Structures are given as structure tokens and as C-alpha cells.
Amino acid sequence: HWGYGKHNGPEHWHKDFPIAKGERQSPVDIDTHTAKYDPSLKPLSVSYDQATSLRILNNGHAFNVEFDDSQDKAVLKGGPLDGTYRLIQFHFHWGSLDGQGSEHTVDKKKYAAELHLVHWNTKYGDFGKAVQQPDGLAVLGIFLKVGSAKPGLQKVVDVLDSIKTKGKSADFTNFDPRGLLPESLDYWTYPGSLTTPPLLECVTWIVLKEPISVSSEQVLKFRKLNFNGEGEPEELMVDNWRPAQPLKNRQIKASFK
Numbered sequence: 001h002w003g004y005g006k007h008n009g010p011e012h013w014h015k016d017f018p019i020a021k022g023e024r025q026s027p028v029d030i031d032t033h034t035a036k037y038d039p040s041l042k043p044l045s046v047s048y049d050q051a052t053s054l055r056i057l058n059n060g061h062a063f064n065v066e067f068d069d070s071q072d073k074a075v076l077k078g079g080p081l082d083g084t085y086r087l088i089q090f091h092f093h094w095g096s097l098d099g100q101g102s103e104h105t106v107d108k109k110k111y112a113a114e115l116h117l118v119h120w121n122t123k124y125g126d127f128g129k130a131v132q133q134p135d136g137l138a139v140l141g142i143f144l145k146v147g148s149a150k151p152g153l154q155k156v157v158d159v160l161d162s163i164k165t166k167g168k169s170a171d172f173t174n175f176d177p178r179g180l181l182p183e184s185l186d187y188w189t190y191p192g193s194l195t196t197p198p199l200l201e202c203v204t205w206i207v208l209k210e211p212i213s214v215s216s217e218q219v220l221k222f223r224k225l226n227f228n229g230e231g232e233p234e235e236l237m238v239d240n241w242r243p244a245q246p247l248k249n250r251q252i253k254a255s256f257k
């Protein structure tokens with residue numbers, strides 16, 4: 001089964017998931033001088049005021065904060081998107097060291113972590129159907145750097161003790177994902193894929209230009225999670241990121257000059 005270790009990590013995924021070598025794989029390096037400003041891009045519409053968080057789950061690859069996606073409660077619209085995309089979960093990727101951890105890079109720079117707010121296109125009815133469509137998902141990617149603490153992240157940090165190992169979940173209601181957004185919604189956008197098997201090529205990526213800052217203490221608590229289940233040998237959940245993949249026949253567009 002796949003993971004991020006020496007023998008099951010990203011360089012092995014193509015043997016079970018041949019689309020790993022496909023035409024629109026993610027993440028990618030964002031070359032800021034090669035991205036083209038696109039004035040036809042609309043401003044993003046992030047409508048999270050009615051968000052209903054439910055649960056936080058350690059799934060052995062990351063932790064997911066899950067939302068009620070059975071109604072239009074927390075939705076992403078606008079930008080490059082047509083239609084309405086519902087937030088289903090968010091999760092992070094992070095490093096063993098502050099100098100690595102993000103999946104996307106910016107002029108080859110790696111951030112300490114990266115947040116993925118995952119949304120699916122309501123015209124496909126459910127998430128499982130959406131991932132089979134080229135415009136099925138819209139993921140808001142947000143970089144994390146280490147600096148000052150992020151107050152809106154602390155409620156996540158404080159529950160991680162209760163989901164240390166694979167398969168553990170905890171109630172996680174009344175969490176407001178607006179507290180994880182930077183000030184600016186300037187973004188790059190390109191067509192890509194899930195960054196984790198099955199690597200389906202169903203994602204419109206919207207990657208925010210402005211990182212959020214988290215404290216060293218906050219990211220240290222991410223690194224205390226476990227990939228393993230309870231009663232298995234402890235392997236710290238760190239470096240759960242896929243490296244940049246070839247851009248191939250894609251253009252990254254920028255919402256800003």
C-alpha cells in the first residue's frame with residue numbers, strides 16, 4: 001500500500017497508479033515569471049460563513065477536517081470556476097524540517113507546509129462522481145511558513161493529541177475555516193490532479209500567492225502525529241508531500257500582476 005516511505009513513496013506510485021506519469025499531474029513548480037496574468041479571471045468567492053465542520057480523522061497519510069457537504073454551506077465559486085464547489089474537507093502536507101513540506105513550490109522555493117481545502121462540483125452530485133470528471137474538484141492551496149502563530153489553527157493543533165494514530169477520529173464541530181485564510185485572495189491557477197493516489201486528473205488548482213504563518217510550536221505538533229496505527233511501530237507523520245511534477249502542456253495563469 002502506498003505512502004511516503006523509501007519503498008512506497010511517490011517514486012513508486014506509478015506502478016499501481018499509472019496516471020502518476022500523466023499529462024496533468026500535481027503538484028507543480030509555479031514559475032512566477034512564466035505564469036501569465038489573465039485579466040478575464042474573476043475574483044474568488046469563498047463563502048464559508050455557514051460551514052459545518054464535523055470530525056477530524058487521521059487517515060494514515062494526513063489528518064482531514066471533514067465538513068457537511070450535503071448542502072451548499074461552505075462553497076467556492078468564481079475565479080476560474082464555473083458553478084459551485086462544496087467544501088468536503090481540508091488537510092495539510094508538512095515536512096520534517098521547516099525548509100520543506102509544501103507540495104507546490106514557488107520559483108522552486110519549498111514552504112514548511114501546505115493546506116488543501118478540497119471542494120467538489122455540485123453538478124456531479126457527490127464527491128465520488130466528481131473525481132471522475134476533469135472539472136470535478138477545486139482545491140484552494142495555501143502555503144504555510146513558520147513565524148508567528150496562526151490563531152485560527154490552534155483549535156486544530158489542540159485536538160491532534162486525540163488522533164495521534166491511523167484510524168483515530170474525534171468530534172470537531174464548529175470550526176471556522178475562515179481563520180486559515182491569508183489577507184489576500186490573489187492566486188495562480190492551473191489544471192491538475194489529486195496529489196495522492198489515485199492521482200485522478202480532476203482538479204482545478206487555485207494556489208494563493210500569500211502564505212499564512214504558523215508558529216514553530218504549531219508545526220512541531222503536526223510532526224508528533226503518527227503514520228502508523230495504535231500498537232504498531234511508531235513512525236512520525238512527517239514529509240507527507242509529493243514533489244513537483246512536470247508541467248507538460250499546461251500554462252499557469254495568475255489573477256494578479
Ligand SMILES: Cc1cc(C(C)C)[n+](CCc2cnc[nH]2)c(C(C)C)c1
Nearest residue numbers: 089118127128131194196197198199
Ligand atoms: C484529498 C482526498 C484525496 C482522495 C484521493 C486520495 C484519491 N480521496 C479519495 C478520493 C476518491 C477516489 N475514488 C473515490 N473517491 C479523498 C476523500 C475525501 C474521499 C480526499
Ligand SMILES: [Zn+2]
Nearest residue numbers: 091093116195
Ligand atoms: Zn493534499
